[model samples]
Target chain A: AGETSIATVGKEGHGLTYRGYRIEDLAANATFEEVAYLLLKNKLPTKSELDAYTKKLVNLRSLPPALKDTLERIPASSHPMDVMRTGCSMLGNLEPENGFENEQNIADRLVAIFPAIQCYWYHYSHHGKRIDTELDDLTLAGYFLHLLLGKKAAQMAIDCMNASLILYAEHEFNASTFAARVCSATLSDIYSAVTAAIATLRGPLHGGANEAAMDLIMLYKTPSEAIAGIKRKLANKELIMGFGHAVYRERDPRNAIIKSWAQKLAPNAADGYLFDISDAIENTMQDEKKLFPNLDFYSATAYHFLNIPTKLFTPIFVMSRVTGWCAHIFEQRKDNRIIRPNADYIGPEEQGWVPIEKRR
Target chain B: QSAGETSIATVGKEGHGLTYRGYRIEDLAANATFEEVAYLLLKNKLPTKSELDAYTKKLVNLRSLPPALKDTLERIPASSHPMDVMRTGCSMLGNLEPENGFENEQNIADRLVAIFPAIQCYWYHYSHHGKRIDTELDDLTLAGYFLHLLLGKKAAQMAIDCMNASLILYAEHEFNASTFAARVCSATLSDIYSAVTAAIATLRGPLHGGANEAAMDLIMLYKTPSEAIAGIKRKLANKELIMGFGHAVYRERDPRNAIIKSWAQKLAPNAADGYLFDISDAIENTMQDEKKLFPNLDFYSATAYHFLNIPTKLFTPIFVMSRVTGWCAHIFEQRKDNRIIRPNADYIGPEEQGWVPIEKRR
Candidate 1:
């Protein structure tokens, strides 16, 4: 009975334990497809289901011309999130299928289409060339890296991306996912709920931590420069972007897996530099302030080494974490209630109006 | 600042004090054209010299829709709400010509300048006329009414003038509900397209700018003033909204109501005596006398729109015609001190647990 019941944590406090599987267990050992299956179906997919899911995802990566034309027409200066929001809306219209009608189909389509929607628009807009969306790849994470970089990624790099996905795939009570659930609880359409989720996620406080992390890394040219910069930044008491998680007070287990991957993906000579800089910053924060690096911190350098555009980092997060958004949407719909909460008013005293011209 | 410094009833507490650059809303509503008000808000003063020339030319030239935009709008489901159609169309437009794409300030301004009328006219003609009309905003005040042109209404010039003036009056407001929502989006440094999209979505809610359309529907539903009152009471009993009566602010009156209500009186004096005005006045009196709530901008805007022969749903779209200016202003304001506007949530549930098998559930 306790297992079936959903839990809520206080503001900025929540943990994920999917199917009794800790995120550390999943991120270290499981692939994105497996995690997606676990979250969606309440159990990991069978080997055949995993294979079928990969192939299906690989195929749906190609977008239709209308969608392609739409993406190409978007002015290059538009925010990627806006492009994605419109793309998702248009995709729902063009496909008009009840992909969310059943759990298996919902899992299948979400894992398949989200990256397709994001990358298809991404490649078309940046390159002004239509690239074939399908790659000869078997894993969802591998295919995402391949399509994003316009070539195949190394196997190790693909594993790292997958681990990153598993880490970010779910976090209980995150604002965007919660917003999506609230939207779903109101009996809104799944598209409407997802649309609201994307809007909420576009805010810097939620899914944008990676972008902020990348900015922190780019601020220092070298390790020596970073040491001084970090000291100065610490003195000013600015909040370091990707070094803390609201829920994980002890430590984010996902960070250790991603830190390992970040090391594995680093070339030998660059490995020492990247590791030294990251470790120094981590140790400095821990020694100075007892703060620890979150999943976003190491994942930024890992993703950057894998040739991801800094701007596309958050979108990639969207591409993967949408699985969690979809899962929560369905869960909220099962026991729906309008999630409207009132604001505690702290404004001026309410009073009668004076005519507009009478003011000083 | 207080945490809820901008909470509901914050700005409107002392309504008469709400002045945009020393010009009262009532004065602006009475005397200023929408173009002038837009210039005042955006440029921080009445336009002069190249400012007026440049602004007018920018708006004038921007009237043409991108061919791709026209095609997209034409393909939308005919059954979709015009507001939703408009929202989707605006999102697509942002993709096509983002605000920052044009390096020249004038060109970027021209895009916003041009797209508003184009979107309105394209969607209007496509939905109503079944033929895409030529995009032009230069017709004498009456002929430029896109709905009139689409519906082929044979209205007197005075009626069209009245409608145009009403559009102008509704064009901008200081941080109204929908505008605030748009500002919230913009405060995150979101693109203007996103901010506009959020604004349009917020405006579609019946409690916001959609009240005008709902008011029109309510007025059209009954034959007599008393019948309208009875219908409203029945709806209230069912917990359904009565559309255009109480407001979040404006306890005594909405400033724009008097101006637009007078237009309704001027244009449709004879028809005003019948069910439309009668029902509106009846609803107003019942709400004030019994519910102690006053009519807002939508109540009289309904009668005015009805006099113009605009369809009930199209009433809100016309409000969009003016409200876009307010949205643009707030978007710009929000961009200056952008914050993600994330508020804390109060969670109410149990702690983490192992996932139970599906079979274990009831």
Candidate 2:
């Protein structure tokens, strides 16, 4: 781990922030695009800057034919995380980073096309149709929802996704972001850095926790049943996915903001018991294990309410956290040392090597 | 900040000694085969005859490529970087045949070590020659198979032994950037392919695994010893990095350099571009006399590889091919005592500020 000026998690009197703007305020007031801009640009964008940024992203939404072909070739059984990895790696080949000066441009392009990358593979492999990724008038969140659902989304669904993206837009030094920094510290290209981060985030203990949470939530249909199930699981000493944090102490501040969105969207969901069961599981973990749900727990139900597939949960985290990873990559380049650390060797002491003819 | 402890290999100790498991680097490079060293790193013990034979057979059987991976490789253009092919190729394989559980970890590692040479050579021949060469060449040793695939002939025992030793030297180093990246990715309990892919991407950077290519580029810049001396001195005066002259941790000298330098000299007469070893030696001596710097592995490994007719771009891909063994070893170690490798960054940005409306901001 290293020091970062990007964002702070679990700091006293100041919750998570991108460039020192509070998470609560940003999630309430800013668009996901705005948060992404602030994370990459180191300050909130002005009105003109925001407009130009938004317009630029719309123009960058298109993918190359080869990339689309590559995406189409990926099987539906492949993890969306693997699809994102392959797509990012392939793009690096098509558009090799010729110079370091173009990193911001590369970052903006990745931010614009991640939704397209995910949804293109999703539709092609899942639905056997290639859809146009050109939606000019939607925000990033709206574009994501539009591409996935094949139409524009409601204001509430879009708003919820926008806030969730903001919440996940940046964190100081998570595994994926740190992995990005490690990759970038070697002076690797931007795509390689992002590709490395995507691979790291594919782990179930990291970005995949939200999807795990979704699966855990759907295991029970009623709050009481969820409570019983959780009690049994705790007694059985099974690991839970989305509760507790390595950095945050009493509560994860992100939980409140996204939980509020989950609450607002709960009443309109087709499954009435989803939110109730999520809450019951939360209360059960709180009472029994004294652990609070992190951002992933409630965001699972929130995504479910928006009709997002459980598999895409981690890739969505990738879509949002790429901004944070890019920010860290830029920060790392400013005063970079190759992030090579020392390791303690606990292997055997110096031993003589015998010939292959020797018996064991 | 410390990412934590690893018991795999240790480097940069006193006298520049390097070891894997517990055996000396010199011993492993000279006596043991690359497959045996790989087993030592992966299984944490030196394999006997039966064990080594069984492991080599396992690797040989996994050499054939899946049809989907072949298609992906065919689709990647010849203009694509060889390192990118490795990165994308490894990712595609993971997609096609994923690790369902930890029990399959050993097979996954073996599969990668086996298939990587085929992955690189298949893509190379397909993209460059528009010919899909058979990946299942009958060379029992990976280094021989690799050279045979590239040259389309049976490599001499001397050339194959040089490759085997080169692979052993490049096999593992403790906590290098790419291996650390692998460990970081794996600490989250990700699959073997993801960790290896991350390692491959990190290794693609010019600062780490690309040094051999850069060293080769520097060596080919001069025609004679005098030019090599003058050019190196000029670069030194201009404060340009001499890519292979220095290392991050090795202070006195790189132990692997002397081992590989002998091979470069032995194979120099057959080199299409003669005097590469001489020019490289001039650069090394100039740096040592002028700045008291010693040549690292990348310095002479460049000339040895050149003598083998391996292209400069494929040099780092060879590093990926070799280092994948170490990366997999590190990945398996990480999984045994896994923890999320999240670390903190000291906040150095603005203090808390009220969010002003974008319309009101200048």
Candidate 3:
């Protein structure tokens, strides 16, 4: 019963809310930055406040030069989550959460700079020269596209990213979010909490679901082929990615929201009609298993359409979900109890020690 | 919640003491160097001479940070929390030379233990001096390397011995916040670097690792025993958070306090003390009188390190450097077994509330 007020998950109901606002409402109307601002500041900024907020974020977007060297050092083959984890750790060392730094300030700093860190490394490791990440764009959605592509992204592409970011921005007590809270309960710094979250999110059962979904979607050329491959795996009792969720028993509100975006933008996206394959996969899963697609199902289709590299899928997740992590960290630390507990130990009980020389 | 159980180490009940792998804390503190204790924690037995010699060689060999990692080190700010330096350094190492099936866990464990002090003092010296001194792993002990790197020269043998003794004492404990954090991280089969980084990050907080540094700051506040007693009284009356006086595990006494306080007495009358030690005595007497509390290991270690002329900020990083052995063993142990640590919290906020026609509230 020790759930959170920051957000709620529906196990028996499909209704999810973040800070009292429905997920549907936020995804439909708010910019990614608005939802991020809401979570970090505990209220949505008004027109002027969001404008000031964008300027402040733009100022924080430049990655520290030392961190650039660290990012540059990481080989391109390294996992993006590992890159984000190491980058966050390096950033903390550059600007620590000491007496001078506040938690919200660091939160905003991470949300603003993560895209730049990821993009800078992406450009440098794949190419030969270091690229400057500073940009005139104040919006996170636009800046993410600009930095990654080295040119302006289309308005449709930017709009799709905004909706996806808002959708991925927060979910109550997901494995990574809970992991972040467990870290915060120990009174650790924000960077540690976020890094732990990133490390856990690397697991396939968690944040990798979107990437896995992309792999599944990319495997088949049409809905008929996807369903056929899926049926064989299901007959073999294989776990399908992006189809059933830990929460949201009846449906994922976010799936429909993102599916709408893919429909709007998919005709010219990087993968044309990728949205068609996803819908076929979704309907087939529901028809066969009575299961529904979650946020990751459509997100993969939408992100691929946005022309983001598939490797950067989860890094983009970090770009938005970091705000939710920040909120959980602050809440977890406010008069926290150590999140210490026992799991059942069904192993050998306190056996006598076997010395090196005596016996095997 | 019994948060699982293990036979690794026991924190004494009823103000008693500590034991790792069935050896008493007092015994280890009396006879061991940090290297030997670290060996015991990781390898699970006292190392015979040949084994100890081999272990020492591996640690020494691994102390040279790869050139890339050193470059990463140069970027960290001097004013950055030193513990954050270790946290970042550990994670960055994992990214560079990732733990794959072929490179063994013990190899990385040994490297992390040996290089911690290197990363720390390397960044420390570079931040202050704008120079990169050799890591001097050519010399063996972590304690000695730390002093040499920070001062850029040889230190007195007695000071080296003092730092080694503190490292041994700070080396390990029962599953505390940081150890638990390490276990939680490794339980998911994350790399050893992630586990250790999580632990270091946990220790950097006000309640844990930085407490040693905070303890020294508290101790340095007064010039005399009488003044200290009065000052502590005023602080208590105002309900300030005193840094080091009691233990979470050892209720009646910390077995470590006397051991380090003994070093404090022997190394006394140095630059920071005369009245400093005397004032510590007064604060102890008053705390016993007012709050029925005892000074823990960090309290006396503060005085000992101050006498060695080690900077107060480095105290916690040294602890991070020293405790990697314990963090390694716990992570290794947890991965050998496993558990997914998580929880359900009481939902106290608006749950069934009007998912209220959204934008009106925003």
Best by DockQ: 2
lDDT of 3 by residue, A96-195 (tens): 7764249878998999999998998889888867887889885799999998888988888888898888888887775577767767775677888898
TM-score for predicted model 3 compared with the true structure:
0.90
Q: Could you tell me how far off, in angstroms, the CA of residue B335 lies in candidate 1 after the best superposition?
A: 3.3
Candidate 3 Cα misplacement greater than 4 A, ranges: A1-3, A96-101, A178-189, A219-238, A263-290, A333-360, B13-15, B101-103, B154-158, B269-275, B351-362
lDDT of 2 by residue, B1-362 (tens): 35667778877447468888877899999898999988988788889999988988888888899988888898888988798899999988988898868799988888998999999999999999999999887788999999998888989998999999999999998887899889888888778889999999999888887888999999888889999999999998999988988787888878899899988999998777768888988988899999999999998999999898898989988998788889998898888877534576667677768888888888
Model 1 per-residue lDDT tens digits across residues A1-360: 001222232224434455556666666666687777777665666667666765666666667666666776676666787767777656544554343465455446656767776787777777777777766788888888887887888788788888888877766655566556554543444554565556557767666787887788777667787778888998997888778765667677677878888787667434346656776678778888888888888887888777788888887777777777777776766755432322223333433433323433
Clashing residue pairs for model 2: A3-B346, A4-B345, A4-B346
Candidate 1 chain B: worst 10 consecutive residues by lDDT?
B1-10
lDDT of 2 at A337: 57
Candidate 3 chain B: worst-modelled 10 consecutive residues by lDDT: B352-361
Docking class of 1: incorrect
Where's the lowest-lDDT run of ten residues in candidate 1 chain A? A1-10
Best of the two (1, 3) by lDDT: 3
Q: Model 3: per-residue lDDT, tens digit, B83-156?
A: 78887888888888787642378778888888888888888889878988788546667778788877778778
- Point to the candidate with the largest TM-score: 2
Interface RMSD of each: 7.2, 1.6, 3.8
Using Cα atoms, each model's DockQ against the true complex is 0.20, 0.70, 0.36
Error of 3 at B91 (Å): 3.0
Fnat values, one per model, are: 0.12, 0.74, 0.38
